Design a protein around this ligand. Structure first.
Ligand code: HEM
Ligand code: HEM
Ligand code: W79
Ligand code: W79
Ligand code: H4B
Ligand code: H4B
Ligand code: ZN
Lengths: 408, 413
């Protein structure tokens, strides 16, 4: 039946009806909740899924059961018969991609969901083609700093043996090197991937912030390396508005956040290669990339230059350093006219977006574990917002890392 | 359901295996189709409902003491059975009551302090008959737990529920709370979240000092009777004035807090028996005060006032002036508590201890139910180790449960 979600700051209550639409499992059961777990086709399987999606589409353009709708259902039928699959209309592709964003429970940026530039790359056949398409994506989405949401969609899966995959988990990442003395240069979370690239012929400049090459797999073939031209890769020097020594830390990050390891599911079709990009929330860099112990891990270094007493944890020296790091990140991007949102503004927008979705759509799936920012949680409004999590389709899903499932 | 579930720590790659979830008893609120993991809150037991619940708990008790299947075990089973058959209920032995209380804490998915679970002082108040007697028991609890600042965790357990019309209840959600007063102009004085309860007390006869930090009276209900008001002797309420190791102006904010965190509105369930009045207390994690009591918009809301005295650019939010003020506030809370030698734990220490706790529980017990949404601190989340820890949440018994607010259910005599 109907479910209610309360905000405990405002005492506003909303009524979720939309959840009655899902089918894919959350992973939880009545007795066990896995809300903090990160990772919890044939003709007869494929058609009902297609049927539902097509029905959903024509429902959204206000003509459910139209003549257009009828032939479409017939068209899809005969096509799954004689090819064991079907191809989406251009309008259905764009719709399905916007709604996959719209249904992404873990994304705090969804107020933007309808403003999405969709690049159809379903005529791609080679890794060289893929590279070209991704280069245009990057150039378009970056837009000299005035970032624009984009997705590039490559050919759907067919037989599992001829998959398109971007092997990079993100389009822009820094390399990670495993020093002899045991330390780590660059991004320590990328050391494996970085070494796969080296093993494939990549000449590493072995520096701290080295853009990794692209590793592209087209139609199931072995993947191939490509260097993204540097002028397409926008980067930002991180400096502080008060601490003039902060630039001396030598930090930079890239402006374009672009996830390339996920799977886009529309109407039971699987787009295994679908890089999508938006713009950053400052905490992603300031908190997670920089301060995670398993990442760049700069907190102790920064605390040094801030002259903080670091003997007891109760001095909250880590907390102080963290806030200052994130100030710099926001300031730097803003100074450089590169789009960025702070976690206060982003969460505000998200509560407004939630309100919108309950109003017009009867709910909005949201993953509180992911939505609440990794710092200053309860002084952002989403902390106090009950959210319901459920899985709506079309969707972005996780998939196996390609280097675990590829015969060469 | 699967016999083995794996959880991962994404910072350390450490993987743990949970078998304890199999012993889950009641429901989470989640289904396969929806997760309620961030929802805050998702006439008595019959003879036939009580039998298996009692046996379940007794079996569990004698397993813990390495006497499962012993003569004493079977005798206790038979005795409980006869008592349920003749009296429709039964009474716990003192040993069982202590075991059950310690395990309700142990099982409390939302508590980050559970490393301490086996060190809990249990006061048996099941011989209490009147509100005055409840008051005496609660005062003793407060004095014991407070221990002049060297706090000790404790629970006081009042008589179990019988027919439902004779409940013992502490009407206060917490033993020590500050009053809130709503003004004609819509401004609030004191703790704005507490205006409803404060109005109840005033109606019941309380003479309100109308100050910013007025400790509320206890409102105590014995054996189903109308509740009665009692003032906690002020000398038993230890308080800490908040000052800052660096900013000498911080003391000029006239802030202070109470030393003892004590929850009194929850229901303790042991072996199907319901203890509707079981105030328990521990000691504070700094963020509870520094972030929530002090900086929630619906609470004391001091971020603005502190920002101003810190000379912060407050036009752009991207300056993160809220964030900077929050850290300083939580620094001052920890500094004021340590200085007055009142037990407190910072959110780094607590969450690190909880990880060690959880790992030990996986090893010895086969699991450790935890509510990530509650365990992770409300500031600086990802620089505490619990943020990166996958947790399974499930409900084991004995347990602490929520219950309706008594002013919503009480039948006034
Ligand atoms: C436009 C501005 C956007 C903002 C400010 C934003 C914000 C965020 C943030 C902060 C995260 C957390 C990422 C992490 O912790 O790894 C996230 C995740 C996510 N976003 Fe958005 N996002 C934006 C655009 C988009 C777009 C354009 C799409 C798809 C077309 C999208 C789909 C997703 C998905 C599927 C996740 C989950 C990632 C995962 O599971 O690893 N987002 N978003
Ligand atoms: C000994 C030191 C303790 C520490 C450091 C500690 C820490 C915490 C914290 C930080 C919370 C969250 C409170 C909130 O956000 O409102 C909490 C909740 C809780 N604690 Fe512990 N606690 C301690 C002792 C105890 C004891 C002695 C018991 C029971 C015997 C207990 C049972 C619970 C329960 C049931 C909750 C959930 C409260 C609710 O749902 O409102 N804790 N604890
Ligand atoms: C798993 N979440 C943390 C994590 C671990 C490892 C790498 C990343 C990561 C690295 N580079 C870029 C990203 C982009 C994340 C993102 C995606 C999108 C579409 C928008 C946005 N603001 N942020 C993530 C994140
Ligand atoms: C619901 N959590 C936020 C909240 C709202 C309203 C009141 C409170 C509250 C007021 N006074 C004291 C507390 C103490 C909670 C607690 C209990 C125990 C046993 C230990 C501890 N560290 N903290 C909470 C908390
Ligand atoms: C909506 C959300 O569940 C609610 O704000 C929760 C979040 N996590 C919490 N965690 C703790 N420790 N205490 C709380 O009161 C809350 N509130
Ligand atoms: C174990 C836990 O689920 C994990 O650390 C999650 C928590 N929330 C998160 N939230 C975001 N936005 N990104 C993350 O990587 C994570 N990690
Ligand atoms: Zn769940």
């Amino acid at each position: 039946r109907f479910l209610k979600v309360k905000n405990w700051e405002t005492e506003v209550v909303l009524t979720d009806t939309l959840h009655l639409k899902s089918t894919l499992e959350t992973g939880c059961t009545e007795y066990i909740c896995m809300g903090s777990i990160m990772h919890p086709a044939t003709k007869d399987q494929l058609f009902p899924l297609a049927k539902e999606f097509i029905d959903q589409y024509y429902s959204s353009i206000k003509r459910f059961g139209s003549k257009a709708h009828m032939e479409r259902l017939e068209e899809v039928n005969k096509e799954i018969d004689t090819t064991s699959t079907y191809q989406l209309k251009d309008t259905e592709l764009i719709y399905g991609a916007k709604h996959a964003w719209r249904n992404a429970s873990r994304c705090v940026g969804r107020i933007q969901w309808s403003k999405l530039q969709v690049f159809d790359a379903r005529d791609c056949t080679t890794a060289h083609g893929m590279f070209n398409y991704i280069c245009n994506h990057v150039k378009y989405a970056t837009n000299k700093g005035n970032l624009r949401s984009a997705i590039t969609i490559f050919p759907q899966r067919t037989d599992g043996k001829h998959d398109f995959r971007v092997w990079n988990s993100q389009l822009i990442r820094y390399a990670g090197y495993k020093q002899p003395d045991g330390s780590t240069l660059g991004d320590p979370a990328n050391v494996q991937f970085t070494e796969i690239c080296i093993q494939q012929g990549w000449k590493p400049p072995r520096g701290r912030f080295d853009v990794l090459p692209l590793l592209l797999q087209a139609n199931g073939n072995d993947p191939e390396l490509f260097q993204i031209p540097p002028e397409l890769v926008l980067e930002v020097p991180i400096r502080h508005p008060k601490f003039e020594w902060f630039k001396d830390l030598g930090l930079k990050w890239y402006g374009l956040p672009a996830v390339s390891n996920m799977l886009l599911e529309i109407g039971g079709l699987e787009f295994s290669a679908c890089p999508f990009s938006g713009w950053y929330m400052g905490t992603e860099i300031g908190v997670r990339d920089y301060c995670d112990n398993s990442r760049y891990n700069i907190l102790e270094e920064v605390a040094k230059k801030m002259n903080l007493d670091m003997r007891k944890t109760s001095s909250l020296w880590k907390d102080q350093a963290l806030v200052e790091i994130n100030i710099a990140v926001l300031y730097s991007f803003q100074s450089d006219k590169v789009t960025i949102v702070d976690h206060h503004s982003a969460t505000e927008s998200f509560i407004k977006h939630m309100e919108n979705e309950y109003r017009c759509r009867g709910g909005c799936p949201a993953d509180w574990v992911w939505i609440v920012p990794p710092m200053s949680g309860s002084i952002t409004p989403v902390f106090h917002q009950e959210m319901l999590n459920y899985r709506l389709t079309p969707s972005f899903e996780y998939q196996p890392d390609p280097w675990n499932t590829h015969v060469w």
